[PDB]
mmCIF file of C-alpha atoms in Angstrom:
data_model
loop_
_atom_site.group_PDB
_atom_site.id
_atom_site.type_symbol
_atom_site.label_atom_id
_atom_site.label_comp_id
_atom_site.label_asym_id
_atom_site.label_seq_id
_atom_site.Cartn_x
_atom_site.Cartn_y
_atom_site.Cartn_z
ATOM 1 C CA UNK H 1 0.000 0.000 0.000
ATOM 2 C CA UNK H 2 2.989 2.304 -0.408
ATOM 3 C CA UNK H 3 4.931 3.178 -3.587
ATOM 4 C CA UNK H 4 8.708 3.647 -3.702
ATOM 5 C CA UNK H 5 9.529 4.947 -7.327
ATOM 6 C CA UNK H 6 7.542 7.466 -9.253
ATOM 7 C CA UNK H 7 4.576 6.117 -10.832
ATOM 8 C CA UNK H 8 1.725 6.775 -13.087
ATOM 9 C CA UNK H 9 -1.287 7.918 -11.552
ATOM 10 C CA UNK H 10 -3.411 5.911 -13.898
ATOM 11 C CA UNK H 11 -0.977 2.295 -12.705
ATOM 12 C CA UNK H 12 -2.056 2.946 -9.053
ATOM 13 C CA UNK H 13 -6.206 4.217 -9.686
ATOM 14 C CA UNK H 14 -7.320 1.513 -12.375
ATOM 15 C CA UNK H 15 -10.718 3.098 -12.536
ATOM 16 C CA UNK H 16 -10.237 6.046 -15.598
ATOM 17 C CA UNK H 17 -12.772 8.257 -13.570
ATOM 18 C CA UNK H 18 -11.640 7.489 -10.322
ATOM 19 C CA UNK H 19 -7.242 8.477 -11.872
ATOM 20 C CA UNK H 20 -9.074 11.664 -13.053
ATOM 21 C CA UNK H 21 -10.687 12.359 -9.652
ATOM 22 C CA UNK H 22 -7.009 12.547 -8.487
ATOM 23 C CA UNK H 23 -4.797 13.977 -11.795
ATOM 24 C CA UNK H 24 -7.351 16.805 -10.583
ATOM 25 C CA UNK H 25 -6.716 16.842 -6.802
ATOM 26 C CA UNK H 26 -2.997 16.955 -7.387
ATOM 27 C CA UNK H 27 -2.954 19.071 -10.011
ATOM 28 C CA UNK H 28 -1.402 16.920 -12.187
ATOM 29 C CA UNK H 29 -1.908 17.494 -16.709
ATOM 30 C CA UNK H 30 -2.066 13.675 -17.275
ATOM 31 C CA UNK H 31 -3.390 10.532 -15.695
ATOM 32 C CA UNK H 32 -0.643 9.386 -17.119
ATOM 33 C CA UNK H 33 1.767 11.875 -15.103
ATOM 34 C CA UNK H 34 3.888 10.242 -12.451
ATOM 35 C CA UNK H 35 3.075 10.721 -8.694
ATOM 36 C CA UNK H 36 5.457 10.127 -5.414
ATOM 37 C CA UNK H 37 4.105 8.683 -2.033
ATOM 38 C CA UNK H 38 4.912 11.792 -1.050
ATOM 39 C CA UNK H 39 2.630 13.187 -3.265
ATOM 40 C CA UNK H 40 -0.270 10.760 -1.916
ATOM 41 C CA UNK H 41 0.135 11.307 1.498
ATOM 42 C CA UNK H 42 -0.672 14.466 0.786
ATOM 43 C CA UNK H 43 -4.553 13.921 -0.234
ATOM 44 C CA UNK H 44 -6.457 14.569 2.900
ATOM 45 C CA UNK H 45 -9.776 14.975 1.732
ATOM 46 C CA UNK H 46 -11.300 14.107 -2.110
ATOM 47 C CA UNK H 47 -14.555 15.501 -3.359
ATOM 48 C CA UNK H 48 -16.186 12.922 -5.845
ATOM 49 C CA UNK H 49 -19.674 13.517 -6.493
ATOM 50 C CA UNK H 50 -21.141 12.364 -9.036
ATOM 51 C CA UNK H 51 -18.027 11.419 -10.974
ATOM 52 C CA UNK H 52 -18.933 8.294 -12.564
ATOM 53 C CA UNK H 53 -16.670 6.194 -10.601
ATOM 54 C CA UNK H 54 -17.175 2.440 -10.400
ATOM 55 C CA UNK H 55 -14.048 1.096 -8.278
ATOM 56 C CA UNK H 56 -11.765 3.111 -5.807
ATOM 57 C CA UNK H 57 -8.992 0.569 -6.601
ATOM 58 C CA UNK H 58 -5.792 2.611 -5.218
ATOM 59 C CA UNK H 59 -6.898 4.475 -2.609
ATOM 60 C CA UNK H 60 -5.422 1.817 -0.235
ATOM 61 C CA UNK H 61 -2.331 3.911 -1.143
ATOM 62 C CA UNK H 62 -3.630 7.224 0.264
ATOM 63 C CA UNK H 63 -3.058 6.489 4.453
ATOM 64 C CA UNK H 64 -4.288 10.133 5.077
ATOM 65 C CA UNK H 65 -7.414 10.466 3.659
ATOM 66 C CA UNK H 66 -9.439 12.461 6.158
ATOM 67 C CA UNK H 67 -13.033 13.133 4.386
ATOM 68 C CA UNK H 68 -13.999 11.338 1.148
ATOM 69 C CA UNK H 69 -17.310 12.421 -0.728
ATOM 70 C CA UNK H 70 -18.497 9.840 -3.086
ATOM 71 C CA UNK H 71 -21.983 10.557 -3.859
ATOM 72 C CA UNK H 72 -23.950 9.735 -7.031
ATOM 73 C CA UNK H 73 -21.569 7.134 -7.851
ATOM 74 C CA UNK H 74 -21.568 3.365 -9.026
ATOM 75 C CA UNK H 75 -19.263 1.804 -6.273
ATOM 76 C CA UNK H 76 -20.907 -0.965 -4.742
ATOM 77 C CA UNK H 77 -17.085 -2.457 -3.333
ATOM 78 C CA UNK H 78 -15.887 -0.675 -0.292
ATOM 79 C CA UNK H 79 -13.243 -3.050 0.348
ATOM 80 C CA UNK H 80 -10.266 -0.627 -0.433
ATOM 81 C CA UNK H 81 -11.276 1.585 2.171
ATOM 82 C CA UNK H 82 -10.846 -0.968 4.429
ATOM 83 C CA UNK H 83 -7.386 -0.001 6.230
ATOM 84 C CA UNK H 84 -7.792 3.805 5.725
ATOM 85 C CA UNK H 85 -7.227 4.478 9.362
ATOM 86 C CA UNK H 86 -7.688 8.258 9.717
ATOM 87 C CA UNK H 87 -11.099 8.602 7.610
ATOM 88 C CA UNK H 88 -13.648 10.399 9.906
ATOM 89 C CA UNK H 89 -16.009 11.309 7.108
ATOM 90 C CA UNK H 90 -17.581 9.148 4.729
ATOM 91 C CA UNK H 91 -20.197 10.386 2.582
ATOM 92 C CA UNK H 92 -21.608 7.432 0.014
ATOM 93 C CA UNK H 93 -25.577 8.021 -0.621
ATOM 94 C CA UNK H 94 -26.809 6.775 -4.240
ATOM 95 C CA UNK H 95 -24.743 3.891 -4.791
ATOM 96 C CA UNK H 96 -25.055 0.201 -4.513
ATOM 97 C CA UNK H 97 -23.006 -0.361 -1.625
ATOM 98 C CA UNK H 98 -24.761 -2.910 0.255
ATOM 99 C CA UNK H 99 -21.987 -5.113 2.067
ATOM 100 C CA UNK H 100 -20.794 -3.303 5.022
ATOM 101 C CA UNK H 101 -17.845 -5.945 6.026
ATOM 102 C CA UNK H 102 -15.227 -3.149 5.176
ATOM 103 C CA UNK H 103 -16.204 -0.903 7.684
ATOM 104 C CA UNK H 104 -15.422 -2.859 10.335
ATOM 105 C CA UNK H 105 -11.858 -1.109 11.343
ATOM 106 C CA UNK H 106 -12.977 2.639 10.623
ATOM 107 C CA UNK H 107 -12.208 3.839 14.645
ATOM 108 C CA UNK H 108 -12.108 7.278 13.885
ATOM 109 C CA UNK H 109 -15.475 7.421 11.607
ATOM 110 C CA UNK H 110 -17.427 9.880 12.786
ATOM 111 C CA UNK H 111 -20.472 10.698 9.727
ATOM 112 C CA UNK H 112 -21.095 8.216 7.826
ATOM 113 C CA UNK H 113 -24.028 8.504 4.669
ATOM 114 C CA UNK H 114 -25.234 5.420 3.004
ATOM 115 C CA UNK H 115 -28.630 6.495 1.842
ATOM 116 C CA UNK H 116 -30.182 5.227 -1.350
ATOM 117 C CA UNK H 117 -27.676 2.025 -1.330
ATOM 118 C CA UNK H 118 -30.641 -0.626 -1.306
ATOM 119 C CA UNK H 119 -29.465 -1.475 1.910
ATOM 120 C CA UNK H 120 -31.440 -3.538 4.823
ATOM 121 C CA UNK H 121 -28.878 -5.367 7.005
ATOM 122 C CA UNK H 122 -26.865 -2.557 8.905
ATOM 123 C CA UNK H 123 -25.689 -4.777 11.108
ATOM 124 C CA UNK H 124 -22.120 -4.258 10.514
ATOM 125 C CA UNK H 125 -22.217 -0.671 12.326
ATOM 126 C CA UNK H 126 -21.775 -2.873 15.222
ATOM 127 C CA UNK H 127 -18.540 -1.806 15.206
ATOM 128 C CA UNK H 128 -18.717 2.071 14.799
ATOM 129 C CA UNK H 129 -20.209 2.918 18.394
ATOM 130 C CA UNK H 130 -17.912 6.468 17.999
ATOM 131 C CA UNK H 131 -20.196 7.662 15.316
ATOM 132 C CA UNK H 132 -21.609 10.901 15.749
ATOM 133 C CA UNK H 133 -23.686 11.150 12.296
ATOM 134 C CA UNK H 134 -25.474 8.593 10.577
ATOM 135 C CA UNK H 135 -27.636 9.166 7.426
ATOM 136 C CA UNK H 136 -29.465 5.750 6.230
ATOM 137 C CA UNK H 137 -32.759 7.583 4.655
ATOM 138 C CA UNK H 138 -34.216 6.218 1.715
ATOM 139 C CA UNK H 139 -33.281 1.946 2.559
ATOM 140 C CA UNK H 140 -34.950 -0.809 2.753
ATOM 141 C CA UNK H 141 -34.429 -1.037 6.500
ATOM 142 C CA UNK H 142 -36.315 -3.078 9.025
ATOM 143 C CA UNK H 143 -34.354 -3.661 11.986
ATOM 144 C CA UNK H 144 -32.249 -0.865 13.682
ATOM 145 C CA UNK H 145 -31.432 -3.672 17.174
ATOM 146 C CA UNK H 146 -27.718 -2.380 16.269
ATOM 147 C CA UNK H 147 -28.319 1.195 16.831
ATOM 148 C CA UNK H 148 -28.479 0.993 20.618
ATOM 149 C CA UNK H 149 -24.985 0.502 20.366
ATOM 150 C CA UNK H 150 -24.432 4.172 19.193
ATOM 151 C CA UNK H 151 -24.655 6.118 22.125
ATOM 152 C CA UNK H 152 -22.049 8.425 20.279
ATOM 153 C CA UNK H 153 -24.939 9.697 17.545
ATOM 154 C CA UNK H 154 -25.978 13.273 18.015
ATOM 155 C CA UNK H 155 -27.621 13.005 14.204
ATOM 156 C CA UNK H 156 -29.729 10.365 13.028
ATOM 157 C CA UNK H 157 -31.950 9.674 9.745
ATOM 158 C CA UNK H 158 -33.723 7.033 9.017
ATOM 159 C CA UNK H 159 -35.886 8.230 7.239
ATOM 160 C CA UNK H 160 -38.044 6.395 4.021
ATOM 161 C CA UNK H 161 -36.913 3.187 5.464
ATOM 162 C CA UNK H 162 -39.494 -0.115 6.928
ATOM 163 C CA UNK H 163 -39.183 0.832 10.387
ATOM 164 C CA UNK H 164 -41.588 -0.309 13.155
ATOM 165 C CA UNK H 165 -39.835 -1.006 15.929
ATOM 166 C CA UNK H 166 -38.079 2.253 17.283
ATOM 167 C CA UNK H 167 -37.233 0.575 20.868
ATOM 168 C CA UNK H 168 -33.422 0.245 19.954
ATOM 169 C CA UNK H 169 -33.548 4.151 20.033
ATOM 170 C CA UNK H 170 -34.839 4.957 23.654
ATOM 171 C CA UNK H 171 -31.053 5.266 25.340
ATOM 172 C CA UNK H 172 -29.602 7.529 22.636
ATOM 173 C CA UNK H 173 -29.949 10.403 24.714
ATOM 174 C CA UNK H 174 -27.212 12.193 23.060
ATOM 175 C CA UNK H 175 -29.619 12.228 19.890
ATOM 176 C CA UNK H 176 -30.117 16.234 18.775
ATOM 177 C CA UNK H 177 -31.797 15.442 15.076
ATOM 178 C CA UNK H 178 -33.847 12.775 14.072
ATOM 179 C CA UNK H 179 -35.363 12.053 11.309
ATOM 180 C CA UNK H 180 -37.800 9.355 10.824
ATOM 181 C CA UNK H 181 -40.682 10.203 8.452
ATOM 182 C CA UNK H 182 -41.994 8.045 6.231
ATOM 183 C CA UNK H 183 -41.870 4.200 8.097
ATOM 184 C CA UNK H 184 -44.189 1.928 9.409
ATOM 185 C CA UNK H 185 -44.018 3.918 13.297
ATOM 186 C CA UNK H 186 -47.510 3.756 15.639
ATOM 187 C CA UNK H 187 -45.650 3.669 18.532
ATOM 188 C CA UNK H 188 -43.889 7.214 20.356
ATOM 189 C CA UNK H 189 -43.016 5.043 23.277
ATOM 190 C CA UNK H 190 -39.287 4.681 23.117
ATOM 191 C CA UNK H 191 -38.387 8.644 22.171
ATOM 192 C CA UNK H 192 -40.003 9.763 25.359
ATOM 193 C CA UNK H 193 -36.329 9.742 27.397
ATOM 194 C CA UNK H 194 -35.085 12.286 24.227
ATOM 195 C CA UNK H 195 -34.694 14.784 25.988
ATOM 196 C CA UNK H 196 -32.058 16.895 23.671
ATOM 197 C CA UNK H 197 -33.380 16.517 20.799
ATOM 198 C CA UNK H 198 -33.637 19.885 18.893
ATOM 199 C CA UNK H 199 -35.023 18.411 15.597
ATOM 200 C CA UNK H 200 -37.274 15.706 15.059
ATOM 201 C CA UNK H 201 -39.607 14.219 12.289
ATOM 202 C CA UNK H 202 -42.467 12.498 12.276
ATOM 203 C CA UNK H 203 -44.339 12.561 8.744
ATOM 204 C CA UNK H 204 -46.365 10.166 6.607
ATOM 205 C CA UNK H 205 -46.146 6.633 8.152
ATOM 206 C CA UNK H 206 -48.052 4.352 6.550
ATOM 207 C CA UNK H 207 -49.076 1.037 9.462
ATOM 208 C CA UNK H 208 -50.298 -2.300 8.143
ATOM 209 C CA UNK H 209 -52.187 -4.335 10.165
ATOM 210 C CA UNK H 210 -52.688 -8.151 10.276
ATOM 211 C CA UNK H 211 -55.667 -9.337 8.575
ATOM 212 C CA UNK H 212 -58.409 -10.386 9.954
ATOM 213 C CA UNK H 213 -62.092 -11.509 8.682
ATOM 214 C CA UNK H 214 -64.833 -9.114 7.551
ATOM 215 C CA UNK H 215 -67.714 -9.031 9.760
ATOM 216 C CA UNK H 216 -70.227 -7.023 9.755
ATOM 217 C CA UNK H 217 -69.924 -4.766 12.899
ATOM 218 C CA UNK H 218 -65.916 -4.839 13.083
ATOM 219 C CA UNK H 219 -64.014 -3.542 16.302
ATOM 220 C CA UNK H 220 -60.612 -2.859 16.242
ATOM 221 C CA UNK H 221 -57.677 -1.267 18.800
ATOM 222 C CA UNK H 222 -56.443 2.221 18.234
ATOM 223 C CA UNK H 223 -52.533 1.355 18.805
ATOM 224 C CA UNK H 224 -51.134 4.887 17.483
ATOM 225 C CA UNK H 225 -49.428 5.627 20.849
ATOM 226 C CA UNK H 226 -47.588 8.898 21.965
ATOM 227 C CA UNK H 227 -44.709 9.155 24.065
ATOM 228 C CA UNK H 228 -46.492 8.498 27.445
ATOM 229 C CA UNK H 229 -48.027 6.042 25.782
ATOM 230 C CA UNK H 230 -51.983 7.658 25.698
ATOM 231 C CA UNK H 231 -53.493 6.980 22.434
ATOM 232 C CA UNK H 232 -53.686 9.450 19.201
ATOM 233 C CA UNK H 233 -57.372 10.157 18.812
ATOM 234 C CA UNK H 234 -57.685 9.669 14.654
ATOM 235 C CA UNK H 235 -58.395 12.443 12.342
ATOM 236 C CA UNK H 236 -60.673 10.917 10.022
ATOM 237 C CA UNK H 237 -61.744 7.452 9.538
ATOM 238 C CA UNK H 238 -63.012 4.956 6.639
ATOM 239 C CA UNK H 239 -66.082 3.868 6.007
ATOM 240 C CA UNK H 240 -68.106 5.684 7.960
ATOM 241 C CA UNK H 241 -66.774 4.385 10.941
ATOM 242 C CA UNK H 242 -66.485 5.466 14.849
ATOM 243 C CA UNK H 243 -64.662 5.753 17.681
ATOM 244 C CA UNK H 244 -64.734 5.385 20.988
ATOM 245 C CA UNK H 245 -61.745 4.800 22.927
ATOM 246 C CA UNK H 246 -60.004 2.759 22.817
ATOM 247 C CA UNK H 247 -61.262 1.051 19.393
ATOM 248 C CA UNK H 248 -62.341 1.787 16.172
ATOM 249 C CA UNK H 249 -65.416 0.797 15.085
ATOM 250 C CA UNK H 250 -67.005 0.439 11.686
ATOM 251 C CA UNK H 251 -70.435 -0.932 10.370
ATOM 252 C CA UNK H 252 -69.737 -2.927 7.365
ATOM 253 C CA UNK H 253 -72.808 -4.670 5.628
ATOM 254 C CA UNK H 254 -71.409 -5.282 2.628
ATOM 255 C CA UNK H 255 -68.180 -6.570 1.698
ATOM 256 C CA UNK H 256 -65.055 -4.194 1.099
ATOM 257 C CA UNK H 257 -61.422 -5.464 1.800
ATOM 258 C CA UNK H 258 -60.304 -2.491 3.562
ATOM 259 C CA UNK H 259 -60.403 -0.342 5.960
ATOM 260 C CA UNK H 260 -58.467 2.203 7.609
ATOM 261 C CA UNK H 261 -57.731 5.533 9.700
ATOM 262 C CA UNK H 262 -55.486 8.461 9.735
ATOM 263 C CA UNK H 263 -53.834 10.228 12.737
ATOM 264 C CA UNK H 264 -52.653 13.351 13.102
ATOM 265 C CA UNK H 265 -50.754 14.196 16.540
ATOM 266 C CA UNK H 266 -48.550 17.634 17.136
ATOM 267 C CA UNK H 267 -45.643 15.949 19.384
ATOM 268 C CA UNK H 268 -42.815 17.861 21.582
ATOM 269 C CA UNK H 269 -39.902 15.994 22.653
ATOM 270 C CA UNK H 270 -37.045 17.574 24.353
ATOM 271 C CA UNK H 271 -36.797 20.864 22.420
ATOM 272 C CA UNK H 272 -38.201 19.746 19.085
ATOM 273 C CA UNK H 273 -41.765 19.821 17.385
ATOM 274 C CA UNK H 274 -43.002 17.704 15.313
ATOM 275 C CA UNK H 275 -46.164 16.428 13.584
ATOM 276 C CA UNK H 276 -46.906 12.918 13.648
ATOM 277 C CA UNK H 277 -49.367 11.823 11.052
ATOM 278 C CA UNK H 278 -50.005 8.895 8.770
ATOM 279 C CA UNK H 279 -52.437 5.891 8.443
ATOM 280 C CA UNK H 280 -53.354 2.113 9.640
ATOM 281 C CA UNK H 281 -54.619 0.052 7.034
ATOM 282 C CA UNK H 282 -56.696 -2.882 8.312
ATOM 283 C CA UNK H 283 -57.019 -5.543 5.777
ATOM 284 C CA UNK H 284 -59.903 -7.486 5.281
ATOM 285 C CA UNK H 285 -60.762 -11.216 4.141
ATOM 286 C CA UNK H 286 -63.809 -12.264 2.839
ATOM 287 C CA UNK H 287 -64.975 -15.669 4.836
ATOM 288 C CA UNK H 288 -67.667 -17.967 4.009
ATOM 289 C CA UNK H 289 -68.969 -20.634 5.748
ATOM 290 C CA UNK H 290 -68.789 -24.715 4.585
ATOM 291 C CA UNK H 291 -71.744 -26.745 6.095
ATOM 292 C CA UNK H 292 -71.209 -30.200 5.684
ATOM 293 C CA UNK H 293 -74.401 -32.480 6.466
ATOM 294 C CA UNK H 294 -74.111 -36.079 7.354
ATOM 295 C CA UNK H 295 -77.890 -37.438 8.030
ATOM 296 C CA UNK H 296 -79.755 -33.707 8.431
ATOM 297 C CA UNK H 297 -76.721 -31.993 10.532
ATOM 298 C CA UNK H 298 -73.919 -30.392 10.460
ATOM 299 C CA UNK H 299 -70.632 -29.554 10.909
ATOM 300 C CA UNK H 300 -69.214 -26.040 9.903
ATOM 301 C CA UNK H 301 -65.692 -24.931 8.374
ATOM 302 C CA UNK H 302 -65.250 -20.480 6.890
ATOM 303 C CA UNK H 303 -63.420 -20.653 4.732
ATOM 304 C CA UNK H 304 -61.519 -17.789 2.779
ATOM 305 C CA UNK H 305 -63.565 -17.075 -0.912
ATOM 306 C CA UNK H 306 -61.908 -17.847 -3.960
ATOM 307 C CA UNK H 307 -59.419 -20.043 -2.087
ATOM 308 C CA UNK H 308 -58.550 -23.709 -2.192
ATOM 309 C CA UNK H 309 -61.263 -25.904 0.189
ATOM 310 C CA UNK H 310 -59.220 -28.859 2.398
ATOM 311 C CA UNK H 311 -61.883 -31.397 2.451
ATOM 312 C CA UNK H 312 -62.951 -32.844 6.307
ATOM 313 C CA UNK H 313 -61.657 -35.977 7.428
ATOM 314 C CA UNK H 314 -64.211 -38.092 5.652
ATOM 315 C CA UNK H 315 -66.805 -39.216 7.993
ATOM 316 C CA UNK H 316 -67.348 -43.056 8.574
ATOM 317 C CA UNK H 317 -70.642 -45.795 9.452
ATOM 318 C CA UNK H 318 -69.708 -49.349 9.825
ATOM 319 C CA UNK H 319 -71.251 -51.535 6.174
ATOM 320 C CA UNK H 320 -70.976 -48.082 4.655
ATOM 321 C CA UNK H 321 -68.042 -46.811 2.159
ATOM 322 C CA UNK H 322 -68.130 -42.611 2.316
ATOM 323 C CA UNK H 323 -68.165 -41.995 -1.897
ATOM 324 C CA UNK H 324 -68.190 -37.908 -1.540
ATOM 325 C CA UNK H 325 -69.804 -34.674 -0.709
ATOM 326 C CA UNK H 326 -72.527 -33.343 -3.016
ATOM 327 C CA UNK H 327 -74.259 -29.959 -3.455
ATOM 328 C CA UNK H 328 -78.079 -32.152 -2.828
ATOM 329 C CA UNK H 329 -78.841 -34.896 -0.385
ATOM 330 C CA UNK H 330 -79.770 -36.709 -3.262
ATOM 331 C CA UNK H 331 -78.924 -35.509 -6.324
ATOM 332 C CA UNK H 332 -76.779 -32.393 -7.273
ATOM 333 C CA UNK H 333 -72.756 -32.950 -8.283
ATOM 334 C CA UNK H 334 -69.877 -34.315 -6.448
ATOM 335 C CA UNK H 335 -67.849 -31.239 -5.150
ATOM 336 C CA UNK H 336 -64.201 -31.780 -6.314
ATOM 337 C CA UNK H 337 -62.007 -30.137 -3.487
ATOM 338 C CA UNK H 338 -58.832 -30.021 -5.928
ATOM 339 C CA UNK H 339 -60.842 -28.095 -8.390
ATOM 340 C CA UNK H 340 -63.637 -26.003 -7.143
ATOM 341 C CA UNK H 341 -62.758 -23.231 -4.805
ATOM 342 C CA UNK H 342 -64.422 -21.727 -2.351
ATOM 343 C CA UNK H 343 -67.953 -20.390 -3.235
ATOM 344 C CA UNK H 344 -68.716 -16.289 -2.484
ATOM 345 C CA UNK H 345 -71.183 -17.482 -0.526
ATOM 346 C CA UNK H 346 -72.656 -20.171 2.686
ATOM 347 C CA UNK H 347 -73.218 -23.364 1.237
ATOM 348 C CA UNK H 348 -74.139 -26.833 2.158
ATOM 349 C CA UNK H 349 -72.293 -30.045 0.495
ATOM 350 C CA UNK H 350 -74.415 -33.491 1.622
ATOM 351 C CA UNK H 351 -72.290 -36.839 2.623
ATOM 352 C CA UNK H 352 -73.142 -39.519 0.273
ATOM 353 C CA UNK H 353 -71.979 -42.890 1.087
ATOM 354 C CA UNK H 354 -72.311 -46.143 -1.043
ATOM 355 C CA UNK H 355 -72.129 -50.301 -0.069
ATOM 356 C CA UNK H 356 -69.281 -51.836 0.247
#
């Protein structure tokens, strides 16, 4: 990772974009002009925006390197930063770096950016806990467990990520700005110990619930929670429906596979405002119930409509041989349960058995 003769700059930075990022931070004429390791310990910081670059081959050869902007890029190998021991800022968003192995030895990192990278595992930042900025907005992040790690951060964005579950947040006191619009978030609880924040955000979370059958007077929690925990009263909700703490309540005679409410909630924490607002969706699945007669009674099964029908375990009489389940008692068609999904709509099938 040294040189010891005079060498091209365009031998040691194999990427053409990349030798022209530093022919012009050395103010060099030629890629092809010869540089000294004098000459590259000399590069503490390179601005690279938007350059075009694919590899950073060579910069193993630059031990100073202090602050290194690489955004808008096409890098998605990070390996050759791997033993740059005195980079403290690391700026990467919109490329494809996904594998954060490389990181691992980066004690002095203090802002990192990764945003737009595609990324969801961050678990590698486990060992970064000096960080003092982190940007990871627009990811495809689920799990932040590692976070609580980072008792350094006094900057934080997560924002346009898959976040639900905040908890790993509630001991990062130090945090000042933090930025987590646009997630999956219901739940304030864990930012209620924040007490320096000066900056925080809150927008547009969208909250999917579980499904769970249509009925026909459906109750359901309200689980949008503020910091102490009391419940957001909604700002408007589907369907006509209602509410009266703590559910939400609709009326739904006919059908629909849907519904949902949207909360609006002014917020302080520490020193910052913010407006938390978004929506739960409840999904909805449209059940039907199977009534299978044996000898004028019945047994029941709902099952989901338009879906595959697993028939019962076929009953049994002794001198008897079960033959199938028909839509009469005695007459109709033999229901064929590898066929003929499930009806929109009750209906009975009939056991019809045959001698042996």
């Amino acid at each position: 990772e040294t040189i010891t003769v005079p060498t091209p700059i365009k031998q040691i930075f194999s990427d053409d974009a990349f030798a022209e990022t530093i022919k012009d931070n050395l103010k060099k004429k030629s890629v092809t002009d010869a540089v000294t390791q004098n000459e590259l310990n000399s590069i503490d910081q390179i601005i690279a925006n938007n350059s075009d670059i694919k590899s950073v081959q060579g910069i193993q050869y630059l031990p100073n390197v202090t602050k290194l902007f690489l955004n808008g890029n096409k890098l998605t190998d990070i390996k050759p930063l791997a033993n740059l021991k005195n980079l403290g800022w690391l700026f990467l968003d919109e490329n494809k770096v996904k594998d954060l192995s490389s990181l691992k030895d980066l004690k002095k990192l203090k802002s990192l950016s990764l945003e737009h990278n595609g990324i969801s595992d961050i678990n590698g930042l486990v060992h970064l806990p000096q960080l003092e900025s982190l940007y990871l907005g627009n990811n495809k992040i689920t799990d932040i467990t590692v976070l609580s790690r980072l008792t350094k951060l006094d900057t934080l964005s997560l924002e346009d990520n898959q976040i639900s579950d905040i908890v790993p947040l509630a001991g990062l006191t130090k945090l000042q700005n933090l930025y987590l619009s646009k997630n999956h978030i219901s739940d304030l609880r864990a930012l209620a110990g924040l007490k320096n924040l000066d900056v925080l955000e809150l927008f547009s979370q969208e909250c999917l619930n579980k499904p769970i059958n249509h009925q026909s007077n459906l109750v359901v929690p309200n689980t949008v929670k503020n910091t102490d925990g009391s419940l957001v009263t909604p700002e408007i909700i589907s369907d006509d429906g209602d509410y009266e703490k703590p559910n939400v309540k609709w009326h739904l005679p006919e059908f629909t596979n849907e519904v949902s409410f949207i909360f609006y909630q002014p917020v302080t924490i520490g020193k910052a405002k913010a407006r938390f607002h978004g929506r739960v969706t409840q999904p909805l699945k449209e059940v039907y119930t199977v009534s299978y007669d044996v000898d004028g009674t019945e047994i029941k099964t709902k099952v989901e409509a338009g879906t595959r029908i697993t028939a019962p375990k076929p009953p049994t009489k002794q001198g008897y041989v079960f033959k199938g389940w028909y839509t009469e008692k005695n007459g109709g068609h033999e229901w064929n349960f590898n066929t003929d999904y499930m009806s929109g709509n009750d209906f009975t099938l009939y056991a019809v058995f045959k001698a042996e």
